[PDB]
Structure formats: C-alpha cells, structure tokens
Amino acid sequence: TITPSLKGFFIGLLSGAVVLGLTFAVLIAISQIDKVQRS
Amino acid sequence: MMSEGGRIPLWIVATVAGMGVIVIVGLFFYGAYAGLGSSL
Amino acid sequence: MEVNQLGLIATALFVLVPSVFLIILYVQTESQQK
Amino acid sequence: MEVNQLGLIATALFVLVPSVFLIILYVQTESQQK
Amino acid sequence: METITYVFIFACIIALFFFAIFFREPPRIT
Amino acid sequence: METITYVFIFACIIALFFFAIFFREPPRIT
Amino acid sequence: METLKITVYIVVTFFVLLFVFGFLSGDPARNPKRKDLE
Amino acid sequence: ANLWERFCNWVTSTDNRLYVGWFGVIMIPTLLAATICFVIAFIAAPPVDIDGIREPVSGSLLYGNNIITGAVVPSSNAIGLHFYPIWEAASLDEWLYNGGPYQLIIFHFLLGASCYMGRQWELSYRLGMRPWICVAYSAPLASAFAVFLIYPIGQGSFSDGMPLGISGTFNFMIVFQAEHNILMHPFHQLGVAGVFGGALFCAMHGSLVTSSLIRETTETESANYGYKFGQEEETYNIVAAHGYFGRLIFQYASFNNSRSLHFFLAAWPVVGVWFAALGISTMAFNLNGFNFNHSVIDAKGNVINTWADIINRANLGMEVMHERNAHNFPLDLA
Amino acid sequence: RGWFDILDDWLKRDRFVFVGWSGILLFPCAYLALGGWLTGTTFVTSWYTHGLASSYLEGCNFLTVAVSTPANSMGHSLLLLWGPEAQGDFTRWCQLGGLWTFIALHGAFGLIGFMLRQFEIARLVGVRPYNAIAFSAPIAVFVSVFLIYPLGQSSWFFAPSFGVAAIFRFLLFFQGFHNWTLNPFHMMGVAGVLGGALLCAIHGATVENTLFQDGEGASTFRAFNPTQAEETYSMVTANRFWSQIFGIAFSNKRWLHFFMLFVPVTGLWMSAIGVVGLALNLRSYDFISQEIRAAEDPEFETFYTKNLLLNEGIRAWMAPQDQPHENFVFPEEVLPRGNAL
Amino acid sequence: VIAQLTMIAMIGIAGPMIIFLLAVRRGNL
Amino acid sequence: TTGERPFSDIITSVRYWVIHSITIPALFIAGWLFVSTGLAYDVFGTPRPDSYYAQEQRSIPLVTDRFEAKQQVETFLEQLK
Amino acid sequence: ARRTWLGDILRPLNSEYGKVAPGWGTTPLMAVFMGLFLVFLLIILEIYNSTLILDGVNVSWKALG
Amino acid sequence: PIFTVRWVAVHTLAVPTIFFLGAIAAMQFIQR
Amino acid sequence: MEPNPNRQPVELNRTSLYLGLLLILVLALLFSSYFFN
Amino acid sequence: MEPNPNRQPVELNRTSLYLGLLLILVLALLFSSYFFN
Ligand code: CLA
Ligand code: CLA
Ligand code: CLA
Ligand code: CLA
Ligand SMILES: CC(C)=CCC/C(C)=C/CC/C(C)=C/CC/C(C)=C/CC/C(C)=C/CC/C(C)=C/CC/C(C)=C/CC/C(C)=C/CC/C(C)=C/CC1=CC(=O)C(C)=C(C)C1=O
Ligand SMILES: CC(C)=CCC/C(C)=C/CC/C(C)=C/CC/C(C)=C/CC/C(C)=C/CC/C(C)=C/CC/C(C)=C/CC/C(C)=C/CC/C(C)=C/CC1=CC(=O)C(C)=C(C)C1=O
Ligand SMILES: CCCCCCCCCCCCCCCC(=O)OC[C@H](COP(=O)(O)OC[C@@H](O)CO)OC(=O)CCCCCCCCCCCCCCC
Ligand SMILES: CCCCCCCCCCCCCCCC(=O)OC[C@H](COP(=O)(O)OC[C@@H](O)CO)OC(=O)CCCCCCCCCCCCCCC
Ligand SMILES: CC1=C(/C=C/C(C)=C/C=C/C(C)=C/C=C/C=C(C)/C=C/C=C(C)/C=C/C2=C(C)CCCC2(C)C)C(C)(C)CCC1
Ligand SMILES: CC1=C(/C=C/C(C)=C/C=C/C(C)=C/C=C/C=C(C)/C=C/C=C(C)/C=C/C2=C(C)CCCC2(C)C)C(C)(C)CCC1
Ligand code: OEX
Ligand SMILES: [Ca+2]
Ligand SMILES: [Cl-]
Ligand SMILES: [Cl-]
Ligand SMILES: [Fe+2]
Ligand SMILES: [Mg+2]
What we know:
The structure is cut from a larger assembly and holds 15 protein chains of twelve kinds. Chain I is mainly α.
C-alpha cells in the first residue's frame, strides 16, 4: 500500500527532479544561445 | 528616459538613499517604544 | 587528593614521545653535511 | 596485587630514556655523509 | 606528584623560551 | 599493569633479536 | 615592614628618576634620521 | 662621554638583543616582580578570603588545585579599593589570607604592560619606523585595564577584578553575565565581531597569500624555502590572489592595494577589541546590556516570552547562586 | 561542440558574479537559507515549539528575533514540507518549526557549494586551494554544532536557534549544563580565535608601520602599485623590531602567512571535536579529585567548585521555561539560592 | 509629531541645499 | 572590467530612477499592506496579540506529538473560542 | 626489476595502465546508477528518520519480537 | 527582454528586501 | 642489494623544533589536569 | 662568533645501538620486579 508518507516521499522526489530538471534545461538553453567566441 | 550615466549626481543619490536608511531605521527604533515589543 | 593514578605516566609519555621524535629529527638534520 | 604504584612509570622511563638516547645517536650517525 | 608534574611542564616551557630567543637560528639576509 | 609491563619489555627484546639478526650492519671484508 | 616600605620607595624612586631624566636626555635626537629637533 | 651619557647610550641602544629603552627601565623590574610573585603564589599561596566573609578560596597548586582550577585569588572585599601593599599588613600570613599577592601582581603587571606599549613606540622611533604598532597593542592592554582595574573601581572592590586563573576567569565571566547581561550589550557584540572577524580575516589572508606563492621549489621540499629573508621581490602573485578573491565574491569586494588590505587587518580586530574593552569599562558603571524582559505582551496583558526572557532565566540562576554566603539584603547593588 | 562543454563554457564565463558548476548548488541553497532566516525572523512565531515570540511581527527586535528549533516531540525529523508532520501545509510547517530544518539543511548544502566554489575558482585562476582548505573550519563548526550536536541529543529542539539572543541562550545553556568553559577542546578553540585575532592585528599593524616611503603623500596608501615587484614594507626592519621587543620574530614571510591560516583554522577544528563530545553529554564537567576532597572537607573551596554552584543555579532557574516539553514544576522551596538573593 | 518631522526635513535639507546650490553656480567648493 | 555597465553609471541615470521611483515605493507599500491587512498572520500562522491564549488559560500550546502535530495545533487554534 | 613466478602470473592484471575508453564512454549509465543510489539512500534515511512510514515496517526495537 | 546574471542576483535580494522593509515599517504601528 | 631511488633525506630546522616543543609542552600543560582528574 | 675548533662529530654504529638497547631492555626486565615490589 501507498502510505501517506510514501506519497509524501514521491512528491518530494518529483519536486526535486523538477527543480533540477528546470534548472539544467534553462542553463543548457542559455549556454546554447550565449556562446563564447573562439576559432 | 536615457540610459545615460551620470545624469543625476552620485552625491545626491548617496545623500537621499542615506537619509532614507536613517528614516527607516529611525522608524524601527520608534517601534521599540510603541505597540508590540514596547513592554507596555 | 584522589587523582587518577595513570595521570603521571600519561602526562610523562605525552611530553616525552613527541618531544623525542622532534629531537631525533633536529639533531640528525644538524649532523647532515653542510 | 598491591604493587608499588610508581613501578610502571619507573620501568617505562628506565627503558625509554636511554633507548631514546641511543636511537637519537644512531639516526644522526646514519644521516652523516657517506 | 600532580603538582610536581604541572610545575615541571611549566619549567620546561620557560627553558624553551630561553633557548628559542637566545639560541634561535639567526635570521640571515642572503 | 605489572604483567603488561613485563610482557611489553619481553616483546621488545624479541623484536630486538629480529632486527639484530636480519637487519644487522653486514660484516664486510675490506 | 617599615624597612620593606622604605626599600620599595627608594627602588621605585630610583627607576622613576631613570625614566624621567632618561627621556629628558635629548630623546628626540635618538632616531636614525633628522636629529636636530630642538 | 661621562657615565650618564654612556648609560643613556646603552639604554637606548638599537644593538641590544632585547631593546631596553626608558619605558624598559620601568617595564623590566615591574614585570619581573609581577611574574615572580605570580609564579610563587600560583604554586604555593594559601587560601584567600576573596569575598571578605572569612570563607577562604584555595587558588594554589600545593593547596589542591590543578592548572585549570588554580588561580591567584583577588584581594578581600573587606579591603575594597584600599591599597594593600605588604607593608600595610601585620605579617605575611595576614597579607596572604587577605589576597595581597593579587594587588602586587596586577599593579606591577598593568604598569609593566603600559610600559611595554610605550617601548613599542620607543623602538619604532629608534629604528626609523612608523609609530603605530603600539596603538594596535592598546586594544588588548585596554582590555586588561578593564578587567583588573576599571571594573574594580566602578564596583568598589578589587575582589571583583578578574582572578588570575583559568577557572577564575570563567567565574568572572558568568557573574558578569548575571549582573550586566553582557551578551546583550552592543560593545561586547562588536568585540565578538572583532575577534570572529579577526580570526576569519587571519585565515583568509593566510590562505590567499599561501594560494598564490610563486613556484621556487620542487615537490620534495617545503615551499617555505622559496622565500629568502630580506629578498627584494614579493614572494606571491598579488594579481593572482586578487583575481581569485574578486571572482569568489565579486571584483570590488577584493582588495588590490596591499596597504589598504593590511590596514584593514589591523583596524578590524583592534577597533572591535577597543569596543570590547569599553563594554567592560562602561558596564563597570552599570550601564548594562539591553533588557527586553517582558517586552512582548499579548492583548490581555499576558507576557509572551522571547529568547531574551530565556536568557533572563539563565541569568537569574547565576545571580541567585553566586557568592552564596555574601549577600544579606535583597538587591545586589555592587 | 556537445551540450556539456557548451554549458561548461557559459557557467565559467568571466562575469560580475561568477557562477560555475558550483553555483548550481550554492546559489539556490545560500539564497533559501538567508531568505528562510529573514522570512522567519520577520513573520514566524515560536509559540507552538517553544512558547516564545520570535518575529518582528510579534514585537521582537533585531536582538531577540530568531528562527527557532522545532518542538522536542519532533525528535530529529527532517520536517520536510511534504512530510508526515506538516503534510504539505505551509502554515502548519512554519508553526511546527519546519523553517529550522529548512535553513539548517539548505545552509549545510550552501556551505558545501561555497567551498566547491573556492575550489572551482582556484582551479580556473590557477592558484593553490588553501582558501577552500581554510574553509573546512567553518564547515566543521557548522556541522558539529547545528547537526551532530542535536543528533546526539533528544531532538533538534536543543540545536542552536537562528537568532542573536537565541544564540546567547545556547552559550549559557552550555555553561550551566555542559560546563563547556572547562573543556580543553573549547579552550584550544578560544586560543585559536583570540590568537588569530592577535595575528590579524599584529601583522596588519606591523606592515603598516614598516612601510617604505614610496611617495610624497602623508597618506601612504597611494604609494602602492598592484603590479610592483618590490615588498611594500621592510621584513628586515620588522624582524629587528619584534626580535628586540618580544624576543622572537618572523623571518620567513611564507611561514608567517601559513601560520595565519594554521592558528584560527586549528582552533575552530578543536572546538568542533569538543562539541561532538557534548552531543553525547561527554563533558569535561568535573575534576573527580576536587569533588572527593570537597565532599569530605566543607572548608575546601576553589574557583572550580564556585562555578559549579553557578551552573546548578543556571539549570534549576532556566530549565522549566527553557525545556517546556518536560513540564518541570520546581516549588519555590527547592530552588537553589544563596542568602538573601 | 508632524511639526517635529517637518522641522527635521527642513533643517536636514539645508546642508545638502548649500552644497547643491554652490555646485550649480560653480562655487568655491 | 566584467562587461556590464558600472553600478555608479546606472544609479545616477534618469532611466534608473524613473523605473525605481515606481517599483521601490510599490514593493514597500505591498509589504506594508501584507502586514496592515493582517495577511502576514494568516500565511505564517503567527498569533495576533489576542491569539496567544484563550481568556483564562496560562499554559502554552506546546506540540507534544510528532505525527499528530498538525492536528494538535489545529486543536489549540479551535480552543481560542 | 625482479621477475617471480607469482609476478609472471599476475602480470596481465597490471598491464593496461592509462588505457581509456574514448570520450564520455559509459558516463551516462554511471549517472543513472548514481541517481538511483541517491534515491536509495534517501529512502533508507527517511525510513530510519520516520519521515517515510511503510506498512509492516515498525522502525522500533519492537520491530519483530 | 535581455537579462544578466548580475541583474538577477541583485533583484533576488533587493526585491524581497524592500517588501520586507515595508512589512516591518507597518509593524511599528501594531498595538496589542 | 640495488639501492632504492625513492629515498629522501628528512629535515627539522631549529625553529620547528622550538615550535614543536612549545606545542607539546603547552598541550601537556593543558591536558595534564584532565589526565589526573 | 668565530667557530670552536674543539668540536668533534659523535657516532653510534648500528651494532652499538643493538647492544645498547639489549643492555637497557634486559636491565629493565631484571629491575622492573623490584621497582613494582
Ligand atoms: C540544488 C538546489 C537545491 C538543493 C540541493 C535543495 C535541497 C533540499 N531541499 Mg530545497 N529548493 C530549491 C533548491 C534546492 N533544494 C529551490 C530552487 C526551491 C524553490 C522551489 C526549493 C524549495 C524547497 C522546499 C519548500 C523544501 C525544500 C527541501 C529540501 C531538502 C529535501 C529535498 C528532497 O527531499 O528532494 C527529493 C528529490 C530529489 C533529491 C531529486 C532526486 C532526482 C533523482 C536524481 C531522479 C532519479 C532519476 C534516475 C537516475 C532515473 C533512473 C531510471 C531507471 C528507473 C531506468 C533538501 C535539503 C525541504 C526541506 O528543506 O524541509 C525542511 C522542503 O520542505 N526545498
Ligand atoms: C621600576 C621599578 C618599580 C616600580 C615603578 C614599582 C611599583 C610599585 N611597587 Mg614594586 N618593586 C620593585 C620595582 C618597582 N615597583 C623591585 C625591584 C622590588 C624588589 C625590591 C619591588 C618590590 C615591591 C613590593 C614588596 C611591593 C611593591 C609595591 C609597588 C607599588 C607601590 C609602590 C609605592 O608605593 O611607591 C611610592 C613611591 C613614591 C610616592 C616616591 C616616588 C617619588 C617620585 C619622584 C614622585 C613622582 C611619581 C609620580 C606618581 C609621577 C610619575 C612620573 C610620571 C609623570 C612619568 C607599585 C605598583 C607594593 C604593592 O605592589 O602594593 C600592592 C608592594 O607591596 N614593590
Ligand atoms: C562564542 C562566544 C563568545 C565569544 C567569541 C566571546 C568573545 C569575547 N569575549 Mg565574551 N562571553 C561569552 C561568550 C563569548 N565571548 C559568554 C557566554 C559570557 C558569559 C558567560 C561572556 C562574558 C564575557 C566577559 C565578562 C568578557 C568577555 C570578553 C570577551 C573578549 C575576550 C578576548 C579579549 O578580551 O581580548 C582582549 C585581550 C586581552 C584581554 C589580552 C591582554 C593581554 C595582555 C596585555 C598581555 C598578557 C601577557 C601574558 C601575561 C603573557 C604572555 C606570554 C608570555 C610568554 C609573553 C572577546 C571579545 C572580555 C572582554 O570584553 O574584555 C574587554 C570580558 O571581560 N566575555
Ligand atoms: C574569550 C571568549 C570566547 C571566545 C574567543 C570563544 C570562541 C569560540 N567559541 Mg566559546 N563561549 C565562551 C567564550 C568564548 N568562546 C563562554 C564563556 C561560553 C559559555 C560556556 C562559550 C560557549 C560556546 C558555545 C556553546 C559554542 C562556542 C563556540 C566557539 C567557537 C565559535 C567559532 C565560530 O566562529 O562559530 C561561528 C559559526 C561558524 C564559523 C559556522 C559557519 C558560519 C557561516 C560561514 C556563516 C555564513 C553567513 C552568511 C554568509 C551571512 C549571514 C546573514 C546575516 C544577515 C546574519 C570559538 C572557538 C562554538 C563551538 O565550539 O563550535 C564548535 C559553540 O557551539 N562557545
Ligand atoms: C535550482 C536553481 C534555480 C539553480 C540556478 C543556479 C544559477 C545558475 C543561479 C544564477 C542566478 C543567481 C546569480 C542567483 C543569485 C542568488 C543569490 C543572490 C544568492 C545569495 C547568496 C548569498 C547568501 C551570498 C552572501 C553574500 C556574501 C558572499 C557576502 C560576503 C561579502 C563579505 C562580507 C566580504 C568580506 C568583506 C571584505 C571587504 C573582505 C576583505 C577582507 C579580506 C578577507 C581580505 C583578504 C585578502 C583579500 C584580497 O583581495 C587579497 C589580494 C589578499 C592577498 C587577501 O589576503
Ligand atoms: C606556576 C605555574 C604552573 C604557572 C602557570 C599557570 C598558568 C595559568 C599557565 C597557563 C597555561 C596555558 C598556556 C594555557 C593555554 C593552553 C591552551 C588553550 C593552549 C592552546 C593549544 C592549541 C594547540 C590550540 C589550538 C589553536 C592554536 C594552534 C593556537 C596557537 C596560538 C598562537 C601561538 C598564536 C600566536 C601568538 C603570538 C604572540 C604570536 C606572535 C607572532 C609574532 C612574533 C608577530 C610579530 C611580527 C609580525 C609581522 O607582521 C612581521 C612582518 C614580523 C617580521 C613579525 O615578527
Ligand atoms: C579618523 C577615524 C578615527 C579613528 C578610529 C580608529 C580606526 C583607525 C585606527 C586603528 C588602529 C590600528 C593600529 C594602527 C594601524 C596603522 O598603522 O594605520 C596606518 C594607516 C595609514 O597611515 P598613513 O600615515 O597613511 O595615514 C595616517 C596619517 O599619517 C594621515 O595621513 O592609518 C590610517 O589609515 C588612519 C585612517 C583614519 C581614517 C578612518 C579609519 C577608519 C575607522 C573609522 C571608525 C569607524 C568604526 C566605528 C563603527 C563601529
Ligand atoms: C621584554 C621581553 C619579553 C620576553 C618574554 C618572553 C617571550 C617568549 C616568547 C615565546 C618564545 C618561544 C617561541 C618558541 C618557537 C619559536 O622559537 O619561534 C620562532 C619562529 C621564527 O619564525 P621564522 O619565520 O624565523 O621561521 C620560519 C621557518 O624557520 C619555519 O621552517 O617564530 C614564529 O614562528 C612566530 C609565531 C610563533 C609564536 C609563538 C608565541 C608563543 C607565546 C607564548 C605561549 C606559551 C605560553 C605558555 C605559558 C605557560
Ligand atoms: C553623502 C554620503 C552618505 C550620506 C550622508 C548623509 C545621508 C547625510 C546627511 C546629511 C544631512 C541631512 C545634513 C545636514 C545638515 C544640516 C544642518 C547642519 C543644519 C543646521 C541647522 C542649524 C544650525 C539651525 C539652527 C536653528 C536654531 C538653533 C534655532 C531655531 C532656528 C534654526 C532652525 C535656524 C553616505 C554615508 C551614504 C555614503 C557616502 C556619502
Ligand atoms: C523561506 C521559503 C522560501 C523563500 C524565501 C525567500 C527567498 C525569501 C526572502 C527574503 C528576503 C531576501 C528578505 C529580505 C530582507 C531584508 C531586510 C529586512 C532587511 C533589512 C535591513 C536593514 C534594516 C538594514 C540595516 C542596517 C544594517 C544591516 C547595518 C548598517 C546600517 C543599517 C542600520 C543600514 C520559499 C518560497 C522557497 C519556500 C518555503 C520557505
Ligand atoms: O563580590 Mn564578586 O559578585 Ca559584584 O555583585 Mn555584589 O559584589 Mn559580589 O555579588 Mn554580585
Ligand atoms: Ca488592545
Ligand atoms: Cl561565585
Ligand atoms: Cl548584602
Ligand atoms: Fe600579509
Ligand atoms: Mg512596536
């Protein structure tokens, strides 16, 4: 069975994944747009 | 609405902001003697 | 006074072991060729 | 057993003091130029 | 013995001050 | 504590035998 | 105690006079640069 | 040259292994007297009636103390601020019972340390240095004056001066908190910022200069051999040091001017500790830490405790227990 | 070429606020720790955890505001917003002390972030990472005091609360309950801090007073150039001064600056070890020989026994309000008190 | 109350006013 | 230099103060109203001056149960009549 | 250097010093296992902490009998 | 709409600060 | 035997001896009271 | 200061170390019983 606290755990885990996922998506996006000049 | 720097002298900015700080902090000190936290 | 009866040897060895280590190292540095 | 409570420190220093003297002398001999 | 021990350590520290000051390796300008 | 002391000294002597034999300065003909 | 008191008073007076006469003995001139400061 | 001239030349000589100087002529005998009396008293002095209630406190090693509990115990509350030299006592036995060693030691010490400060000015002048090292030392000196002299003056007794011992110090501190709420005093708070800040900046500076040492040595030797005493060139790259620290925070929080940096290192702990000393020296006249006891009240008038009220309970515990036999009346007024 | 290298480029660009890979950990955690503290001290109570007002909103001032530890009944609960205690209710979370674990945990990861930043920046600029190494001392202190200590005790309740007066209470508790001043690990800590402040002052003063005249100005700061090859002050004159004043002096600038790292860093590390013992009540509370003598001899008195009487006062007088979960009722007649007071 | 705050602002502005006025007319600052 | 315009150039510009003569007073007033409307109490669960105790009680509403802490606080809040 | 019977046997096991797989190799897979390990640690921690409470898992001395 | 890291950094601090100062200003007039 | 090339001389200068002895003695002076208890 | 020409280096060879340590250890093994009494 899924206890309240296990549901709590899943909520925590997803939240963390979202924060990290969004942070990296945004940082990758920005880095792709704003490149360093070098050749 | 120019982004031109130096249009408002930095000494005026510093004085006004400085007086702003004094006023806000002064208010906080007043509050130590009135309403909540005043012991009264 | 009812002190710990190992305090004396603990203090003595605490001083002597590392002091001796340093003295050994110092003296053999001095004796090295200049 | 009711031994002399200074026997431990007496024995430990009896060994350590001259042993340390010898080790100091030995090591600084070794570190001298060949 | 405790007192002897404390005074001994203190006495060694004072002796160390003497050697550290008057028998230091002298600082030398190269 | 006495027993520890006696056995400790004995053990040091045995270790000394080991070094004196296997880690002696080798005799060399000049 | 009277003897101790007198002994200390003389000792203290002695060192204090050393201090005062010492600093009166041309102290500004005791530097490695400009000596004539009077 | 006459005898006095030669003497003055030797006293003020820049060539003595330890500088003497005119401040030194007072410093040397006074510090030797304080030191000798301290050492003899710490080892061998009998118990001292600190609080003037015929309840002698043992400070010395031979009378049952270790290094941590031992002290030279302050002079008797019956004495107060009265001058109690050996010659005012009927006997050494009386002088010892009443805490005479403490007065002898602290007065010689304070004079000697004041001259230590003057001596620092003095040698700087003889060597053609700038003069203000002595100003930095004025901070710990002021702090010593605060606990050995100014506090006793304000409270009316050398029995309230800081004891010359490790546990005696803690005693002084705890009683001080009970009686002045020093933790809640902004000058002690500035003191803490001074010493925490001093230790932080000590570590920071040390680490930054160490981080940027120019390679002058191999891996099998200490980097310290890469600097030679008296060399003309700097031993580390300050540009690298600044380039690191500026990026750690942001460019303009970093000092690039070494003179400005070293002035800041001097000033921060020195100013903080001057405030610490002034904390003790003004709490000496009972202008005490902030008191927010029952400052927060609800709509009905119920006291709503804050952390200040919890501090106050701890202070009360110290207050009611200290010198448990000395107070006959309800208020501790000094 | 390749998203990772592209991201690395951008993260490590020389901008006003350096970011780096470390910044991904550091900036959010440090921001949330600081923002957590400001939020709690401005708006949040400690009524349900401590029976205390703790915010500007309730009438506290800068000295008395705090973010307080959770109630003792919470034990060492992580107290996550979505956890079984608050169950996703933000208001209840605040009332249960959830901002305390919030700030402690984000603060811990932020400190990790900052030290990683020190490493990252040192590697990029090409300096040795001694600043990071030195930072291990603040980390040992934070971890031992805010994590290890309460973890050995009954609950987070006994960790320090984040506040000025709250921290003062923590000090006094450690005196009364742990006799913390008697602890040689704390004593070494004191030595490192005061010795560090001493070194800071004396070195700063020494440099400033052995400066070479490198300009005509009476204000001497202008007469320094960041790129100059020459020492700005005289090591030789400094050494002579201190040798003659104090008996010894530095002669080696590298040793000098390493020692400045060593002293306060070692001091803080030692104090951390003592606090780890205190997590377990493994105190330096007593000297047994002192107690045996004092128990048998009612005329034997030292400053050590005097301080224990103060400690006993502290415990009895502060415990009922400081430890409300215990429901202490100490009748007036059982309170230790000297005469009159 | 308001009279106190008004005197504050008037006296307080006066200093910066002397400086601002002189800066405007290239005075001997 | 790092590539951004200096702060001293920004905070002495007309554009800056035109923007911030609006945004600064606005944030300040929003903060004032967060408190003056009493919303701050409700968001954070901080007692108003009349919400520390019920009329007669002198006992603190201390949380004593880890897992029923939410309910306990709710109960305490109901007991405020 | 000295060859020995056992040294000859073990030789192949110390022969590929410095040999690498090109570029990122198995790094992406490693990251997955790291993430899974992190979640695992979080689970056992929250169980021990009583932040995660599971049916039939009584984290107490009275766990079995 | 072009932002900078510095711009973001400044405003994550400055924006709440002003809001909080308004809040605390208001608190000075609360009476029990 | 063929000599080991990894050998290095070890050093402790006088200042380090004095610093080290100071550390040890002061630590002993500090810890001794707790050893005797 | 001008160096002292009377200075001589001192030596203890390994065999002498071993002999000396044996003397000391065996003396300690002999006398230890009497020190404990
Ligand atoms: C790096 C930034 C960072 C870090 C390290 C943290 C850290 C933390 N947060 Mg904070 N937080 C952040 C940013 C961060 N936060 C931001 C930006 C916000 C604003 C939205 C918040 C708002 C916030 C709140 C309100 C709270 C926290 C809380 C916490 C704590 C618990 C978090 C948790 O349990 O996550 C669990 C989730 C993870 C650890 C993510 C795991 C993702 C894994 C790697 C995915 C697995 C994928 C796998 C590899 C795939 C394999 C496939 C296979 C099956 C085939 C912890 C100290 C809680 C706390 O402080 O309580 C006291 C809490 O209440 N955070
Ligand atoms: C530099 C040397 C020196 C100084 C300054 C002191 C100072 C002190 N001694 Mg110590 N003492 C010393 C060396 C010194 N001692 C030595 C070498 C010994 C071993 C013999 C002692 C043994 C000793 C004992 C046993 C005791 C003292 C005590 C004292 C105190 C009182 C002294 C007194 O009453 O004299 C007063 C002297 C005079 C009034 C005459 C001075 C005449 C001059 C010309 C007047 C000008 C002075 C004036 C104040 C201004 C100063 C000048 C300024 C502007 C520069 C005082 C702290 C006593 C003590 O500590 O009490 C608690 C005490 O019991 N001393
Ligand atoms: C973390 C907690 C904390 C911290 C960081 C501090 C920090 C400080 N406290 Mg506070 N305090 C605290 C908690 C804390 N306290 C608590 C919990 C209480 C109540 C229990 C107190 C009550 C308290 C009191 C009552 C006092 C302090 C004082 C101080 C200062 C001590 C250092 C000093 O005086 O330098 C100054 C330097 C010196 C005193 C050294 C003088 C050195 C002389 C000049 C030379 C000595 C030479 C020596 C004999 C020989 C050297 C060796 C030889 C070989 C040459 C410092 C600002 C003291 C202070 O403010 O003093 C002004 C003080 O009196 N605190
Ligand atoms: C002579 C006086 C004196 C001195 C110098 C000290 C010194 C010390 N004390 Mg002791 N104390 C004293 C007297 C003194 N104490 C007395 C009389 C008592 C009563 C028993 C105590 C009780 C006491 C306790 C209970 C504790 C200490 C601790 C310490 C250490 C604190 C180290 C530190 O900086 O932590 C400060 C914190 C850190 C370094 C952690 C990291 C901080 C990060 C880097 C901050 C980041 C801030 C962020 C950027 C900005 C914040 C925003 C802002 C708005 C606030 C240090 C050794 C502590 C210790 O031993 O810990 C191991 C400790 O817990 N003391
Ligand atoms: C999950 C998500 C969203 C992730 C996104 C991550 C991401 C990419 C974010 C980017 C966006 C962004 C930047 C957000 C910012 C968020 C934010 C504002 C977070 C706040 C962080 C925070 C709490 C910061 C605290 C502020 C801070 C660092 C303060 C310290 C400043 C301070 C007090 C400095 C000391 C003062 C001072 C002048 C010291 C100098 C004295 C000193 C130590 C001298 C030593 C010294 C100096 C030298 O100079 C040189 C030469 C040498 C020899 C030397 O001895
Ligand atoms: C009869 C009896 C027994 C009497 C004794 C009774 C009694 C109470 C004794 C006291 C016992 C005692 C000592 C207790 C203290 C115990 C204790 C807590 C010890 C701490 C031990 C320890 C390992 C702590 C860890 C932290 C740590 C490493 C601290 C070290 C502190 C330390 C030594 C700091 C330096 C202090 C100091 C004075 C430095 C001077 C440096 C110096 C010469 C600077 C001058 C200088 C500056 C320049 O800038 C330049 C350029 C030059 C050239 C230059 O020169
Ligand atoms: C004018 C400030 C008032 C002095 C306050 C004390 C701080 C300065 C002295 C510290 C002593 C350190 C030991 C000697 C260290 C030493 O030798 O310093 C040397 C340093 C440089 O010497 P210079 O010869 O270049 O300048 C001094 C004179 O010759 C004038 O040119 O002196 C200064 O910088 C003085 C600066 C005063 C200007 C302001 C100082 C900042 C403090 C302001 C107070 C604010 C704090 C209060 C808030 C809580
Ligand atoms: C009026 C005269 C006053 C003289 C009073 C006597 C002062 C004694 C000063 C300390 C001498 C001992 C130094 C040994 C060690 C020694 O000889 O150091 C010498 C050393 C010289 O440094 P250098 O830069 O020349 O050497 C570096 C390289 O050689 C390293 O490889 O000095 C330092 O390291 C300074 C920092 C240590 C500062 C330690 C100060 C300690 C204060 C006393 C604490 C003990 C208190 C115990 C009380 C019971
Ligand atoms: C710039 C700056 C700043 C700031 C500052 C400030 C903010 C200030 C101020 C100020 C001020 C704000 C002022 C003033 C003034 C004034 C005055 C000085 C006046 C006066 C007056 C009088 C004298 C009067 C009188 C009278 C009487 C007696 C009676 C009746 C009538 C009358 C009223 C006429 C800062 C720090 C940020 C930084 C850097 C720079
Ligand atoms: C917790 C939390 C969070 C967050 C948050 C935040 C991030 C915040 C913030 C915040 C902030 C960020 C705030 C602020 C502020 C502030 C203030 C309130 C201030 C102040 C100030 C002052 C008052 C000043 C003063 C002064 C000083 C300092 C010194 C010198 C002078 C003067 C006096 C100027 C989240 C959502 C995730 C979730 C859950 C929980
Ligand atoms: O002598 Mn030392 O502590 Ca100044 O408060 Mn009153 O008196 Mn006694 O009592 Mn609290
Ligand atoms: Ca009302
Ligand atoms: Cl007391
Ligand atoms: Cl009374
Ligand atoms: Fe430096
Ligand atoms: Mg108010």
